[PDB]
């Protein structure tokens, strides 16, 4: 039901298998594992510096 | 109203005689002491 | 006054008590939303589970 | 002569404290009227084999506290310390006695969330127990002040007003003890 709100990045439009998305667990800021994925808000939170 | 504005730290450098509910009025207007007593009751 | 120290204690106790109740606004749930008469069992944990109501009481 | 300002302030505040216990009494009486026949209900089983000796100790603490007042008015600081230390020890026994009774009541199924009777019983007696604990702190603080300076009439006044709070606490317990363990 939320698939219509997905915005694709240039060069990565076909990187998903339907409704399955694969994102790196390493935070781009300092390398901490950012695995606080909220299912409803679709927000991935890094517990080290709150990204 | 019988002390300065603003009052000192201890609120009073002097104290007048208290004989009614209006000591300041009695102090500032001594000539009205007799009138208030006589005209108090209608 | 009769108790100069206790008179000053009332001011600060009141000021910090008032700030605690108002401090419920910064909470995500919000401050108290049940009215100043805080009727029961609306003010109950089941019907008022947020910390804003708890800060209002204390 | 002169009215004791500290005594007047303590007595006036003590009367206000009585209204605080009025709310606690209201909760107990309101729940009692809704019991329907069982007050206290099962499995709560109050025993007088422990409450009575603990209550008598608190009552006896008032007599020793009053003895210290006589020493305080006489100017005998050492006599004041002796009687207040004894009062503190027996006052401490009341807290330990009440705490011991709490453990057995909890183990038998009488808890604050377990029953409505548990709520009115624990908050009414527990808040009084907090007052006893607060009174014990007052005893220690006053006794510590006696070794700081010479025994002055102001120092003796502080001893008297502390005993006023202790007498008020003991009187409140008598009302609570009679209401709970006798008026069932």
């Amino acid at each position: 039901a939320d698939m219509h709100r997905v915005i694709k990045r240039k060069g990565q439009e076909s990187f998903n298998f339907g409704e399955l998305f694969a994102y790196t667990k390493v935070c781009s800021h300092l390398g901490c594992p950012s695995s606080l994925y909220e299912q409803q808000t679709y927000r991935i939170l890094c517990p080290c510096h709150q990204s | 109203w019988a002390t300065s504005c603003p009052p000192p730290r201890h609120n009073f450098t002097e104290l007048p005689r208290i004989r009614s509910e209006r000591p300041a009025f009695e102090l500032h207007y001594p000539h009205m002491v007799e009138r208030m007593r006589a005209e108090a009751h209608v | 006054v009769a108790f100069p120290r206790l008179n000053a204690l009332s001011f600060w106790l009141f000021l910090f008590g008032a700030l605690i109740a108002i401090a419920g606004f910064i909470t995500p749930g919000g401050a108290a939303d049940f009215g100043w008469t805080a009727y029961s069992p609306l003010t109950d944990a089941i019907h008022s589970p947020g910390a804003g109501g708890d800060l209002w009481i204390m | 002569n002169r009215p004791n300002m500290v005594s007047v302030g303590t007595i006036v505040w003590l009367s206000s404290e009585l209204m605080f216990f009025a709310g606690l009494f209201a909760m107990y009486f309101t729940a009692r009227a809704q019991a329907g026949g069982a007050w206290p209900p099962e499995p709560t089983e109050l025993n007088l084999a422990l409450a009575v000796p603990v209550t008598l100790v608190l009552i006896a603490s008032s007599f020793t506290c009053q003895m210290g007042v006589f020493a305080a008015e006489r100017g005998d600081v050492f006599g004041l310390r002796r009687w207040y230390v004894i009062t503190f020890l027996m006052g401490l026994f009341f807290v330990l006695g009440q705490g011991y009774e709490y453990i057995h009541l909890v183990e038998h199924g009488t808890t604050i969330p377990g029953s409505a009777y548990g709520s009115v019983f624990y908050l009414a007696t527990g808040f009084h127990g907090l007052h006893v604990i607060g009174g014990l702190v007052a005893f220690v603080l006053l006794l510590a002040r006696t070794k700081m300076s010479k025994f002055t009439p102001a120092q003796a006044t502080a001893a008297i007003v502390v005993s006023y709070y202790w007498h008020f606490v003991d009187i409140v317990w008598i009302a609570l003890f009679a209401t709970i363990y006798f008026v069932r």
Binding site: - | - | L13, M58 | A22, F29, L141, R145, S149
Partner: protein, 139 residues
């Protein structure tokens, strides 16, 4: 201080009459019998004035006419030292902060914060009580 005690006795009589009348008026007319939460407050409201009124009665009968209790008293009659009044103290603000710390802990139900607040309150209250009694340092 005859008038001071008379004020509380006047309130005592009215509170006692209201508590007795309202208790006896709800026992036979209110639905459910006696209004308990409501009556208990009225009965102990009388006790608030009774305790203060009785103490003021005993105090009045001990001391004679004070300069402020004399209809025609002179200002010079009250000359002399009144007592001790604290000139300054930062302890009261610390007591309020200590009490507020425990209240926040109680509101959010933080056992560690409640314990810290209670310890802070005792420490702050100790400073207030001992402020004008600490002796000079012995080195």
């Amino acid at each position: 201080m005859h008038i001071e005690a008379r004020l509380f006795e006047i309130l005592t009589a009215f509170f006692a009459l209201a508590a007795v009348v309202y208790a006896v008026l709800t026992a036979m007319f209110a639905t459910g019998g006696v209004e308990w939460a409501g009556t208990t407050a009225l009965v102990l409201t009388t006790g608030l004035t009774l305790i203060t009124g009785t103490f003021f009665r005993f105090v009045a009968r001990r001391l004679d006419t004070r300069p402020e209790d004399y209809e025609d008293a002179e200002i010079s009659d009250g000359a002399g030292e009144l007592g001790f009044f604290a000139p300054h103290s930062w302890w009261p603000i610390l007591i309020s902060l200590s009490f507020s710390t425990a209240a926040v802990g109680a509101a959010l139900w933080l056992p560690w914060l409640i314990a810290a607040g209670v310890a802070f309150v005792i420490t702050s209250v100790c400073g207030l009580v001992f402020e004008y009694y600490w002796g000079p340092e012995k080195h």
